[PDB]
């Protein structure tokens, strides 16, 4: 059964997401304008988008039960490694299979494969990124499962640089068991079939997507002129 504590946990993560994801996308107006003409013409805009989203991912992680019990250092390593993965995850909410783009409310802020390409990335990342978005969308997760997956992604024991892996793992196990139990008690079949295992597989896909993004990011950022168009937070979090 879903204990009171597990329901409390789901309640907290739902609210935390509510406070950190604005479905109206009103803030996108603050970003440098998107240019769709020109090499890297979408980099300033998507760099801003990402920087804004890292800030939101951080606010979410702070409200993850137990996350605050970690040392400043472990909090930092967990966010540095998970940030891009949680951004790929959370972006599923704006992704649409209708035309395989991320649709943020208006044509200006609708992003497709060629936009991401004009941000300095290649199909080696972009294709499997879309396949990821598609397969995640096909799980048709409950919002409860969506926020649990993001939280589990953030508190992962095997992230590089982790110190207190025993405690990271203990916090994750609490969220994992919350998710496994939620699915059994609240996700009716056939949608529930192997759903936990499919969700964990998506966390593996995310590791692979993380690895490739980092590679294309290092190539992009190694050019001082490109790294110039990024933001200070992106340079600190993604590396410089």
């Amino acid at each position: 059964k879903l204990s009171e504590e597990q329901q409390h946990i789901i309640a907290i993560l739902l609210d935390a997401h509510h406070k950190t994801y604005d479905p109206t996308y009103a803030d996108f107006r603050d970003f440098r304008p998107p240019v769709r003409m020109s090499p890297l013409s979408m980099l300033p805009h998507l760099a801003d988008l990402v920087s804004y989203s890292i800030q939101k991912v951080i606010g979410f992680a702070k409200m993850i039960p137990g996350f605050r019990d970690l040392t400043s250092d472990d909090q930092i390593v967990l966010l540095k490694s998970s940030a891009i993965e949680v951004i790929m995850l959370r972006s599923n909410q704006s992704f649409t299979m209708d035309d395989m783009s991320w649709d943020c409310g208006s044509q200006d802020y609708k992003y497709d494969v060629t936009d991401v390409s004009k941000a300095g990335h290649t199909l080696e990342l972009i294709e499997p990124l879309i396949k990821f978005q598609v397969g995640l969308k096909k799980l048709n997760l409950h919002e409860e499962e969506h926020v649990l997956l993001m939280a589990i992604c953030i508190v992962s024991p095997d992230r590089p640089g982790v110190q207190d892996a025993k405690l990271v793992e203990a916090i994750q196990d609490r969220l994992s068991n919350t998710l496994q139990t939620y699915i059994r008690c609240r996700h009716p079949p056939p949608g529930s079939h192997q759903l936990y295992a499919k969700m964990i597989q998506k966390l593996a896909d995310l590791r692979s997507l993380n690895e490739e993004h980092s590679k294309q990011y290092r190539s992009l950022s190694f050019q001082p002129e490109n790294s110039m168009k990024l933001t200070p937070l992106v340079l600190e979090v993604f590396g410089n």
């Binding site: 800030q55 951080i58 606010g59 702070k62 400043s72 250092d73 909090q75 930092i76 966010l79 540095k80 200070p232 937070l233 600190e236 979090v237």
Partner: peptide
């Protein structure tokens, strides 16, 4: 370890 902005956003 030299993450001023991450650390500030986490506090």
């Amino acid at each position: 370890k030299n993450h001023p902005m991450l650390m500030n956003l986490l506090k």
